[PDB]
A = this chain, B = another copy of it.
């Protein structure tokens, strides 16, 4: 008796130059029970409470120089609306003073979502993204 609960766990494309592109067409990545991936967005199949999450890993070869801001945000666009309203968001400054550094950003929470809602997981600096290993950059939803 499989669960008919809308789920998604999409991973970053390690090929995408200067961007964060999500894939469902990889090992241990899924899109099930009505969830779609259109224009780098997860599309909500039906109303209900959902658990929403994302992780991104940033890496830079030494802090030198100038102050860097790393944002990671999960946004929602309701049906008939156009602008992304932020659900979860984090701003990290990895530079103390101007040796490789690492900053993981984990966002997660519970949200009531509507049919046709489009969800985005975005970063401001894809030049700092790290996908050497698997499991480092992901985005998903779990229908409760």
Contacts and interface: CB of A to CB of B under 8 A. Distances in A.
Contacts of A115: none
A2 to B, nearest CB: 6
B135 A110 contact: yes
A37 interface: no
Interface string A89-106: 111110111011111111
B3 A112 contact: no
B144 A5 contact: yes
A105 B91 CA distance: 10
Contacts of A100: 67, 93
Contacts of A27: 85
Interface string A51-81: 1010101010000000101000111100000
Interface in A112-143: 112, 130, 133-136, 138, 140, 142
Contacts of A90: 55, 57, 102, 104, 106, 136
B144 A7 contact: yes
A15 interface: no
Contacts of A69: 102
Nearest to A100: B93
A28 B76 contact: yes
Contacts of A8: 110
The 6 closest A-B pairs by CB, nearest first: A89-B135, A86-B135, A3-B144, A90-B104, A109-B135, A93-B102
